[PDB]
Write a protein that binds this ligand. Structure first.
Ligand code: MOO
Length: 231
């Protein structure tokens, strides 16, 4: 048998490892299609034969639910991604406590904070949220190094060109050139969350069993290894 998963592309490597583990354990092929959450939600809306949908945000799963394309009795948040402060691997910077008393000016060592463009990059929007809530935005706003996406903000830090950056936990794990030096409190910003649901009409035995497996120990260990949080 086989199960077809439409999963946000940020989950590519985790999902591929889970597929190989599930094959070797249950002898069932997991077929994954990776693309943006927007792309997959519209494909599912138009009737694509996906069995499961894992979105990188609640918004696009809300969209699929509004179009009656996913089974709402099966929807639940599968993963989180922490919002983290990263530094270049070679930096003297050690891990520090992130709270209302963090001395951001001293941590910047004369440089700028790398972020996704807070006008539209989600990691930047969330960075801005957390910094405003913690009362640091007044200090940090004139000291930003905005980037076109998370990868561009990561590149500033990997090349020692910015002393700090704000990315997701899974981005930090995928980048060998950066190290986590702090984690924002989850309530300082909107939660980064990956909901999972069975696509409407696809709640059969084999789909349901892989659906359950994604929440079990083997899949959870793989997600954590890639820097996601589990539920
Ligand atoms: O899958 Mo997305 O484009 O990161 O929301």
């Amino acid at each position: 048998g086989k199960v077809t998963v439409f999963a946000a592309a940020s989950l590519t490597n985790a999902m591929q490892d889970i597929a190989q583990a599930y094959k070797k354990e249950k002898n069932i092929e997991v077929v994954s299609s990776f693309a943006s959450s927007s792309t997959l939600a519209r494909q599912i809306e138009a009737g694509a034969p996906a069995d499961l949908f894992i979105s990188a945000d609640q918004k696009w799963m809300d969209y699929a639910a509004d179009k009656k394309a996913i089974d709402p009795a099966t929807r639940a948040t599968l993963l989180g991604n922490s919002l983290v402060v990263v530094a270049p691997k070679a930096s003297a910077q050690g891990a520090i406590t992130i709270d209302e008393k963090t001395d951001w000016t001293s941590l910047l060592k004369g440089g700028r904070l790398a972020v996704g463009d807070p006008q539209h990059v989600p990691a930047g929007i969330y960075a801005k949220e957390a910094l405003q809530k913690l009362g640091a935005w007044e200090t940090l706003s004139p000291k930003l190094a905005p980037a076109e996406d998370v990868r561009g903000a990561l590149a500033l830090v990997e090349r020692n060109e910015a002393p700090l950056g704000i990315v997701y936990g899974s981005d930090a794990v995928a980048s060998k050139g950066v190290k986590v030096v702090g984690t924002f409190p989850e309530a300082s910003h909107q939660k980064v969350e990956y909901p999972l649901a069975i696509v409407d009409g696809h709640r059969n035995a084999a789909v349901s069993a892989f659906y359950d497996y994604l929440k079990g120990p083997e899949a959870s260990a793989i997600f954590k290894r890639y820097g996601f949080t589990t539920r």
